[model samples]
Target: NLPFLEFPGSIVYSYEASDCSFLSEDISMRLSDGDVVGFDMEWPPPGKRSRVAVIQLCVSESKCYLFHISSMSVFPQGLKMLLENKSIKKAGVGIEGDQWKLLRDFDVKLESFVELTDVANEKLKCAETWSLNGLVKHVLGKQLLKDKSIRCSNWSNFPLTEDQKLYAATDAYAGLIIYQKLGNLG
Candidate 1:
């Protein structure tokens, strides 16, 4: 089941770029800063093998950036640096899987990350299973819209659909927002 609703209390600002060259200096700077941010990745459909296709980063409750990974030969330097920086806290659910895929496909290692599920289980004392959908519903009191139609779509293709963009953005943004809310509660 999927739920549709506006992000609680804030208007989310979303950005998409097929090429790293399109990324602005200011946005890059914000990502590199030592602050907590949301992180997630989308990979192509399962086959004999697959690769990471989209990288999602949410810098604020109102801002998210989606990087099209298949378009570039190498990971963007700024993003790469940010992921490797130990000072920046990257928050996500099922982060170990994302990190494993990143290391396997992109040859990159992420640093300084907190798994939302772990935090909720250990710190927040929530009985719900630590999935993104469950945590969002538990922490934010809202259902997250996860479109399975786009779940297995071809993310390597250029010009991702509006639905695809929004869905991808929301996954990462949801993680960050939940973390912020949990922090407030504790």
Candidate 2:
């Protein structure tokens, strides 16, 4: 059986998480002082792994944000700050997608990244599989579902359903949890 996790407020459908208010002040402060942020992205692709659209990011252990860059005219400045910061190190599975999407869509360049999939396979020697959802379920007993049908669901569309936000947040939170556990293992 799948357990439920509820978000705090009403849902607003945009490419970015509406509840990102939690990180707004801190992100501004971090951008001012200089900080390395970590991130990941999820999207509804056209064929197989070819069509990625959503981007996920973590500013700290307690906060993760997802952006629907497909809709907004300009990305949140904080995201731009992290992407442009040469000193900031962004790491996650499929970070290439995050970099490519930001570049292709937002005209942003992603720099300084460590691919978590590479680390899991090359360093951790976890040869079974590398998908974040799969790894989290197998290793941590947590299941996250990134709805395949919604990847291309016109992120610019308003009134994003609760299911979508929960899906995005689960990925971010689950990834952070597993990463910490794995990092501790080594």
Candidate 3:
């Protein structure tokens, strides 16, 4: 689909904050500043019912903010405004499920969002489905290693391991990177 490049190194400016107060200020500022973010959500493995556990927003190539949804009783208004704003673009892969879950769980509707897989499908004109891993390989020539064990683990629980944090952060970060690469093609 896209030309290959080497894997980008670690995200050095990623921040994880479970407290709503800490996130409210920075998130509001970033949103007000008209940031284009890589947005994503994570929950426990699919079952009878699923609750969103974390929301990751990558404000820049190196700066990512991870909000633990389970830690807050109410979703922040600023975050909701950012999600619904038409001016700011939030990029992700296969984000319709995330949009649905956000609406169902927090009554928040996502707008002005770009789904990377959709872009790949349209631009690449490929028959095979383009997953994040596949896109990473196609564009970056790197394996986006997904640890299946942590994917089904308890995200509602705090103190996530380094592996889980890295995994979650990378997912959102990859979406942003893919979108940037696709834009370059155009």
Candidate 2 local lDDT, 1-186, one digit each (tens): 544322232222335433333344455456543344446665543333433355666555555566665555556666565566666666666777777867776687888776667666755675655787666665566556555665445443444555666566555555555556666674
**In model 1, which regions exceed 4 Å deviation?**
1-28, 31-34, 126-128
- Each model's total of backbone clashes: 1, 8, 0
Q: Clashes in model 2: which pairs?
A: 13-160, 15-67, 15-68, 16-68, 40-56, 43-53, 44-151, 45-51
Q: Compose the digit string of candidate 3's lDDT tens values, residues 53-160.
A: 888877666576677767667776666766787777888988987888889988989988888888887777765677778888986666776667876778877766
| Alpha carbon lDDT of each predicted model | 0.73, 0.57, 0.72
Q: What is the lDDT of residue 62 in candidate 1?
A: 70
Off by over 4 Å in 2: 1-25, 31-38, 44-54, 126-129, 146-153
lDDT tens string, model 1, 45-90?
7347878888887777677777887766766766676677787888
For candidate 3, the 10 contiguous residues with the lowest summed lDDT are: 6-15
What is the Å distance of residue 63 in model 2 from its true position? 2.8
Tell me the TM-score of each prediction against the true structure. 0.83, 0.68, 0.82
Tell me each candidate's RMSD, in Å, in order.
Answer: 3.5, 5.0, 4.0
Top-TM-score structure, candidate number: 1
